[PDB]
Symmetry: D2
Subunit: 430 residues, 4 copies
């Protein structure tokens, strides 16, 4: 293994206890599936933010029988204490806060041997997937990949369309219990957290520009508005844009507010959102950040190349002075601000996300000599069955004291579903 | 025709001038498609709440070339000046506020005769499923219908029950489950039209009250939001753990009706299911508890039991009945359990109804124009194509002054869609 | 008496049974003070919107022993079934919906005669100041009035102008500035009754629209909140930097009417000032812009200019006038600039009006019982004592099921108040 | 001086730059009053949280001519970098994070000499005021004190009532621009910040108990609800309690929710809110914190004395194990959580607060041989004049782009104020 400081493992372990209590879903799967060991002999290479919450996931997969080796999926997201807690325990992990792109891909390469290869992939952003497929040989050897975020799943569909998807892929992001909770309610808390730990800026009164209005944009807009920001939103999709208008947000172009906005938040999963056209027009000390998976939503390379002064205010906060004499504050060098300047999403919402990930791995690994998840030419992307999506939500109601009504036989019949569900048809959007 | 009072045509013509300006989408289809007349030949049997909004829909269909005959799909939903205006214009309408069950039935049968030729309709446009049921189960139109478009969740639920049972003979387009309907009309429509119905009915203060919203689907989401916006403390009931986790995560107590039945001042039923508010709840309610339904059918509330077992019933005003129970305490029932927004107010505002009714126009066009293309065999349920979903939304941005960002080619390639969309994959939940 | 239609007494009696159950505070004063009759001798001249809520106020005063004569303080605010019920009960009322300016004037003069003795009133109860102005400037009652209680901000503003000018002769109790009035009625009342007036008037969608709220006092705060709750993008105008910073800090753009006059779909004037929406604004407005006022007098809007300079005026329905301007575009004016909540709807709900009208009962009791104690010389403006402010609030908690913590002696000593309060210093702003 | 680490001054200075930009009010007073030196020879002993924001205040008072010596007012609130930045500059400061009660009062004693005494007091919480008055001789020597928070001002009024107020006191907390901004909007951002930096807990879904519903409680409740918490509120005041009910919060007793609440937040400024009666009933890992000025709102001494295990999770987060085997997480040992576990209120809102503080010091110090602020027997508590309250708000509108409307002479006359204000009568509550 390799982590910043192994001494921090003790502190890491103390917080994993509190993290475990806040993740009743992951812990119940540990009770339920621990004994039967559904991932007996699984060899999972994981590429996903090395947080305290991922620490609980990792320890679940090992509890369910899996061998596992881990790397972060971002150079700033690793929490040095969670990594050290995993390392002290003996699960091979290669992650620390502040990796170079070279060290990053080094860490990811360490997880693809020494089990000896992996036979399963667990990924957040598609870097591992693309790498295993395009740079190794692991196309007779890997039985499935579980993909956690929208940009990675986009990646997966570009491969299916092209004819290059060689292994079955589970689309975890698009579980209702991931997509409409993690992406939405997670960012609604973890965006402002990163902004505030970085800059301690007052949100109340400010004009914020939120680019994109999908699940991430929805959450980020609701958070900023909640603290008294006036939020304006940009969009390319007429539907998402109209959702934003009907929720009371102005929908305009970045150019329309670039000179007046105090805060710029990128949420699209698309590159070149905030560019060389925008930077020189920004007000003094306009804070610029991104919460989408890749930093290239912001032209940071341009900012660095064209700024006249750069000051590290503190780690993951760079204050640039432009040729016009005004300042730009960039957060986490454009990397995911919630994970880079704070601790990401709280444990409780990641319990939903990671439950789907555990269920996904069980689905693909246990059914490996089944033909239910075909290899090679005919490999395709799948979702978790809706029954399992419901199971995950049901596992998280108790902690909150939410009480569920039970359908009578006549009611289930009238609605056209089973008494124990699934309750909605597969096209339902929640 | 058959309306209450034809001298209300003048007043309805005046409001339709305001309705037209609030429905840019429908008026923009009137301009785009009227010259070519794509529903020429079309003989539409219509069964949808006869409001001012539907009047702009009915005149769009006739501008597009269709012959049309209409009836309201609820006994108390007609706006009498709406029907009077359409009736003067020469369109056959059978609809008044306060139809008995007998009279309601007669009106529907009128819409299935009196076309040109041995003019039996060749098309259906449905809200709730009743017309579809009557035509397929009881009329003879066996060889004569090329499609049905279905407006609501309850009506669509029946279509899927029929298809499942091998009894769907005519192709059906699911309009409710267009994104620009379900995530707009069901949600934002109810967010404004629910409290409108309650207040016009009772003038009651929302702020400070305890309100039990039963169900937390698209309609339940909207109602809870509306009540909470006015300072109600809203508690939610759900059978679905996913919807329940959403409500919990938005700040609402999720409990059983029985947990709040003694303290709630307001009960709203939004389920699309029967026997939510029953004989076991009614005698437990606090004095002057307001009970209403905004689901399609009234049998979410056991109103027959209420009527059978009340000691006293008083009409405060039409559609507001105050019952005295055996216990001496009172229950205020709205619209006899009928959709309260349409029953005690005017239904959703025009602007949102423009989203829904655009979908209905493009669905009728899609079904009818492919009536000799063999694309919808006379039998499945279909969705409007996402391209047309987006179009609907795009037509409504201008009125609000919302501006849409345009993707570059690099950007569209990177996110895997055309520069002009569809922008999202078919399973996206918005 | 003089009402529109006395056969509406029956319908009004039925609604007053619901109003009574929604006004626990007024009904609790009826029980507490009725036995002792503390307003015995009292001859109250009343000038306050003749609604169902005021009917419960008028019957409380008469239960308390007072003789009372009433007139509405606005031409379109009367609820005709409210007046019909009070008129049947034997109380002299002069009030109908749609009084001319002549007729309005006659009704007020009726309330100043016909008491017992050479029965000139000995008390005034005012909303807006007009009765106070008429009695003091133009009637003879010079030796005969022991007090006036003033309901609203505009009326109270006049009382302070008079006191300043050395023209206040009768003691005045400022009821508007009780906390349980100003921070409740003005705020929460308008939060529900504004959109009620707009929607009953126009059925217009709020969601998605741009609304200009002019003024951000207690009424402005409520209106903006209401519009925003439904997905309006609200912009605010203010002359006061403190109120402006509040609106900015709550997420609202603070700008000049001229900055949004061309794009706003909805203008609300809440200032208590004249010439907010003027001849310079009207010709600039978008087609079918909705203009209304919820301030006391209509002259916040230059309606005379509008009427003088419109090419066309059309009555969509009573109190909804659609003007065609020289430019060909339309303006929708509500209630001819009169208070839109009372003009196009029913005013604030009963429950909040119970807070305000309790204050009015305890103010009349305070003034009248000290009518031979020399406490209010016949001349200053006064406030209800904070003890009675708190009492009003305390009377309304039960209905909502709110529970109040009780201070220990140690705790009351530590925060420097009695165990039973007053709990706050006289300058506390809540 | 004495601070943790003088080396941190550099980092401290970099952030004071960003803090200055975010405090346009303080910086404008520095421009306006810098030249004339209104505090020429002032000798200000300051007892107020030694944050980055206080650093900007301190440097303003020195810019305006004052000598100044500083101590924190809480043992956990000092930001070691801001203190070091002040110390490097040469302003005597005695503060570090993690002072003992002995070291704390040592630091406060250092500020009352070496100018040689002070002649002015600047205080947050009343510890300095009480000390200077009850333990020194500085009753011929001190010309005025400026008091920043509600509990200190309470203290001041207990002294006035008793007859022990010997020097004029400026009540800064009760400036509208302090009370209704700092207390309200400040806590609305800085509460969740402290909770999240401490525990990274998910707010969405949780039941939070907020004790008190004054300005602090209002903000804290709005913040928690904003992230999807279900917030219940406790109160002793019927008015504040009814405000909470009408905003949609349950109002109940701590005993009513003690077993189910995930988070307990104390906001009263009263002791013994969360006690030995509550601790043993709390759910596993219930988070307990206080945001009021003194930690004695929570019985921490009891918790420590009766818990079976205590673990420092990390600095300012103690996890206690109770005799029942369940856990309590206590934040900042019960001290102000926003300052103790985070960075307090953002700079922009503290600019309002500290502008009143600068204006206050100028008012008392410049008018020292005036008799406007009488010494000894007849000393009384004063507010800032309303003109100056408005000035402070006006200084903060620009940064936000808020545009103020200018009254015409007729409008100012009609409203009964000057064109340049003050705009409201002194009883106005905003
Ligand atoms: N930071 C985190 O902890 C975390 C969590 C979840 C998701 N994500 C990431 O966030 C990103 C977005 O995820 P999502 O679920 O919201 O995706 P999404 O598809 O739901 O939303 C993205 C939105 O951006 C819009 N868009 C595309 N190009 C645009 C342009 N140039 N300008 C304005 N809008 C544009 C799309 O139309 C879409 O609605 C992805 O990169 C995903 O991997 C990060
Ligand atoms: N009044 C209107 O103008 C209007 C508008 C749109 C839709 N509708 C109607 O409203 C109803 C709801 O529509 P929707 O789109 O929200 O449907 P939906 O399926 O999304 O929501 C209904 C919800 O009720 C829940 N439910 C079912 N039985 C329950 C029970 N016994 N107790 C608690 N919850 C239960 C389901 O889990 C579901 O989430 C339908 O009947 C639809 O036709 C009315
Ligand atoms: N319709 C109702 O049922 C109802 C209820 C209560 C009060 N009112 C009336 O509503 C009005 C407002 O009451 P309030 O309690 O909010 O008064 P308020 O003094 O608190 O608020 C009025 C606000 O308007 C601002 N203002 C003044 N002139 C302005 C201008 N030209 N442009 C922009 N802003 C300007 C002021 O600064 C002030 O903050 C009064 O006339 C009052 O009598 C009506
Ligand atoms: N942490 C910070 O950065 C900061 C900022 C501002 C104020 N404060 C402090 O916060 C505290 C409150 O300030 P505020 O301005 O809200 O005061 P406030 O008087 O407006 O509010 C306190 C409320 O608590 C209520 N109360 C008293 N005893 C109670 C009891 N035992 N149970 C429930 N409620 C009770 C009162 O009725 C009152 O409404 C003070 O100690 C003040 O110094 C701290
Ligand atoms: N805390 C987190 N851990 C892992 N992945 C995340 C997190 N937040 C967002 N994505
Ligand atoms: N106004 C309306 N017209 C037709 N159908 C509706 C309406 N509102 C909800 N459903
Ligand atoms: N309903 C009402 N009755 C009297 N006065 C009012 C009302 N609403 C606002 N002001
Ligand atoms: N940041 C802060 N600085 C000084 N005092 C405060 C602060 N927050 C609350 N009170």
């Amino acid at each position: 293994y390799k982590v910043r400081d192994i001494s921090l493992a003790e502190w890491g372990r103390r917080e994993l206890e509190l993290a475990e209590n806040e993740m009743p879903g992951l812990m119940e799967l540990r009770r339920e599936y621990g004994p039967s060991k559904p991932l007996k002999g699984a060899k999972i290479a994981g590429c996903l933010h090395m947080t305290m919450q991922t620490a609980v996931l990792i320890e679940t997969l090992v509890e369910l029988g899996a061998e596992v080796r881990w790397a972060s999926c971002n150079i700033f997201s690793t929490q040095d204490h969670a990594a050290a807690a995993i390392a002290k325990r003996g699960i091979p992990v290669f992650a620390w806060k502040g990796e170079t792109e070279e060290e990053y891909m080094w860490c990811m390469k360490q997880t693809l041997k020494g089990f000896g290869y992996p036979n399963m992939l667990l990924d957040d952003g598609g870097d591992l997937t693309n790498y295993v497929l395009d740079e190794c040989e692991l196309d007779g050897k890997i039985y499935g990949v579980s993909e956690e975020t929208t940009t990675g799943v986009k990646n997966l569909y570009k491969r299916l369309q092209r004819g290059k998807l060689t292994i079955p892929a589970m689309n975890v992001n698009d579980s209702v219990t991931k997509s409409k909770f993690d992406n939405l309610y997670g960012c609604r808390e973890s965006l402002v957290d990163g902004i505030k730990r970085a800059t301690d800026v007052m949100i109340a009164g400010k004009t914020a520009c939120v680019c994109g209005y999908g699940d991430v944009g929805k959450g980020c807009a609701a958070a900023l508005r909640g603290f008294g920001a006036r939020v304006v939103v940009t969009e390319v999709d007429p539907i998402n844009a109209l959702q934003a208008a009907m929720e009371g947000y102005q929908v305009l172009l970045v150019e329309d507010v670039v000179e007046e906005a105090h805060i710029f938040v990128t949420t699209t999963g698309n590159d070149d959102i905030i560019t060389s056209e925008h930077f020189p027009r920004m007000r003094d000390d306009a804070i610029v950040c991104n919460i989408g998976h890749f930093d290239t939503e912001i032209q940071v390379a341009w900012l660095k190349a064209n700024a006249k002064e750069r000051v590290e205010v503190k780690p993951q906060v760079d204050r640039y002075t432009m040729a016009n004499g005004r300042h730009i504050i960039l957060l986490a060098e454009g990397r995911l601000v919630n994970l880079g300047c704070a601790s990401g999403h709280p444990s409780f919402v990641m319990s939903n996300s990671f439950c789907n990930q555990v269920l996904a791995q069980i689905e693909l690994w246990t059914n490996r000599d089944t033909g239910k998840y075909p290899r090679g030419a005919k490999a395709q992307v799948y979702f978790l069955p809706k029954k399992l999506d419901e199971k995950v939500a049901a596992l998280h109601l108790g902690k909150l004291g939410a009480k569920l009504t039970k359908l009578t036989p006549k009611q289930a019949e009238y609605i056209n579903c089973p008494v124990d569900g699934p309750f909605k048809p597969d096209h339902y959007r929640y």
